[PDB]
């Protein structure tokens, strides 16, 4: 229960995210997006998926431009319109006797101090 509460609290905290966290995450995502394609199979799979879903393979310049536009206020808006006090779907397997019921779990996704 402590783990679930802290996880959902950190989820809800994104409504007031700072500016250094956003920049660090942007740099990490920009690095990790094009760093997982080493073998030819991975590159071919990425090309196939990207062309299948959207319809074009975005150039790295376009990806850099789209990532650059992100600011902290956009993160706050998205977290407020998607995460802040919204329905969740859970699924547990194993020894879950200590996992509390649904309402208590959901109550932690919206902080009451604000």
């Amino acid at each position: 229960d402590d783990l679930v509460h802290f996880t959902l609290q950190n989820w809800a905290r994104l409504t007031v995210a700072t500016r250094a966290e956003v920049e660090r995450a942007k740099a990490q995502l920009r690095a990790s997006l094009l760093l997982s394609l080493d073998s030819t199979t991975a590159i071919a799979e990425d090309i196939g998926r990207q062309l299948l879903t959207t319809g074009r393979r975005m150039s790295p310049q376009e990806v850099d431009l789209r990532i650059g536009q992100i600011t902290e206020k956009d993160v706050a808006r998205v977290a407020s319109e998607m995460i802040w006090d919204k329905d969740i779907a859970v699924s547990a397997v194993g020894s879950i006797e200590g996992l509390l019921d649904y309402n208590r779990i959901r109550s932690s996704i919206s902080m009451n101090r604000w």
Binding site: V16, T18, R19, A20, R113, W114
Partner: protein, 77 residues
Amino acid sequence: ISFFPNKPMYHVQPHISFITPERTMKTIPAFSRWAFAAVAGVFVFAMQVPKVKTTILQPIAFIGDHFKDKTPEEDKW
């Protein structure tokens, strides 16, 4: 002369314990709203007090009619 010289865009601001001006500026609306709520609660919990009734509630128009006494010549002995 820079934290992380390779990235001079960063800086360190004064702080006591996770208390920074950037975070301080964010919590001001919450403090203002809480103060307004507390003031409204204190107001609503004390509105039959004679001094408050005769000083604050009575002079306001369209509300003072209800908050005024309606005792004719039959009054205090």
